[PDB]
Structures are given as structure tokens and as C-alpha cells.
Symmetry: C4
Subunit: 70 residues, 4 copies
Amino acid sequence: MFIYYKRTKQGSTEQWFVIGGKRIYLPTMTYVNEANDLIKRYGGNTNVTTYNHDNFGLKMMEAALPQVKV
Amino acid sequence: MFIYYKRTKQGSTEQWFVIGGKRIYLPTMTYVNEANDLIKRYGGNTNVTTYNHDNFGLKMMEAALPQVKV
Amino acid sequence: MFIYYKRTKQGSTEQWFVIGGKRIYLPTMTYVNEANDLIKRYGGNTNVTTYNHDNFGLKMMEAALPQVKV
Amino acid sequence: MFIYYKRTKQGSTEQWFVIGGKRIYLPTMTYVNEANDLIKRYGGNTNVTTYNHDNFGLKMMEAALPQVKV
């Protein structure tokens, strides 16, 4: 599990949480805090990387990790 | 793999087992024991955390980890 | 990734390979060897455990890890 | 996450990226570079192994890890 940042085409920065082979968009700072709590408890990765929307690394992550909504 | 606890709306506490990107409700103490045996054998996480039913961390785990029944 | 053994109802012992959240029955010693090669290369778990067909730990693994055929 | 090489029946060598329980064919050196960047950031495995198309280890990986396209 880890969090990454996504710089959108419209300019905003989104925080996304990878868990269980899935991707979750974090809509509020309270969701961000709880995701970081999960990372701390379950040995997740504390790396934070910001990806431009067109970055190939981001694209491969979005292809392999289905989005789920909370 | 790890176990967590869930405090239900009706007040009970459920034990859940995360494995293979899935969630398993543990119906008996014998299932709990065997799950902890799996954790010990395969390098799982021994963290035990109790989540209120409405906690956002729990909610993200339930969204990303499909339930399977045993 | 890891291998486990399953003692079947008819008495035989099957070797199974867990990878990618899936279970693979290993039909020959050549498949067993190649699976152990994968374990050695990709940091898998070298634990070998034998499960009776009715063991609850095995049952939870079979519920959470879909079988795929090779 | 890790990269492996596949020696095809027609003789070419393909680079594949394993992430999230999925397999991604890497079509360009820029995709290879970004995949290795992901490996470095998220604690992936730096092992590089070349598999002949008929190798049983490769076959089990292809059975257990669905291909996704980028």
C-alpha cells in the first residue's frame, strides 16, 4: 500500500491510495489521514511521488490497479 | 495477510482475515486460530486494530478487498 | 509466492503453488522445480506446510486464491 | 513488482512488467525506464530473468497474472 499524487490535465493535484491491487481516490484530508494510518499499521510504503497525468509510470499503475470508490 | 477487528453497528465485534487481496469473516475461534497460523507461516502482519464500522480506513479496506466466504 | 501441500480425501498429496493471488496445482516434478525457481528469484516464502483437505487454513486459502490452470 | 524478459517463438525478446498481480508488455525503452522507476520507488524486485516462451515458470506467471495494456 502507498499513496501517490496525480497532476490532472485541468491542473489540480489528486491524492490516490493503492491497496489490495486497487486504486482509491482520496476525496478529503480525513481520508488521506486514515490511509496514512493504514500504511503505518500494515508495513506500507511511505514514498510520495507526484505523477503528471500523461506519465507512463502512472499510466501503467492505472492500467493494472482497478479504481474502487469509497 | 493480517487480522483486524470490526465494531458493528449493532455493537458486536467481528474478526476479519485479509488474505490474497480478499477479506474473510472469521466465524469461530478455530478459524481465528488457523488464520493466525497462516500469518505466522507466511510472514503476515501481526498488527491487530479495531475499526468502528464507519471508520474511513475500514471503509477503504472493504472497498478494495472483496469478501469471500469459507 | 509459496508452495503448500494438500492431503486429499482419496489420500494422495498434491503440491500447490500460490502466485499473484492465485493457486496453481503442480502436476509434475518439473513444474515443482520451476515454481521453486520462481520463489528463489522473486523473494518468495520457502515454508512448506502440509494441509489436510478439511483444514480451515487451507479452506480459507482456497476461498481467497482462485485456481488457474497451466 | 519486477521486470522479466520473454524469448518469443519468432525469436524476439520482449520485456514484461509485473505489477498489481498483472502483466504489462513494455513496448518502448521509455516504458522500460518508467517501470524501473516504479520498482525503485516501491520496493520492487530488481531481478532480471529471461524466459523461453515454453518455460513452465513463465507459463505459470502468464496463467496467474492477467495481461493489461497501457
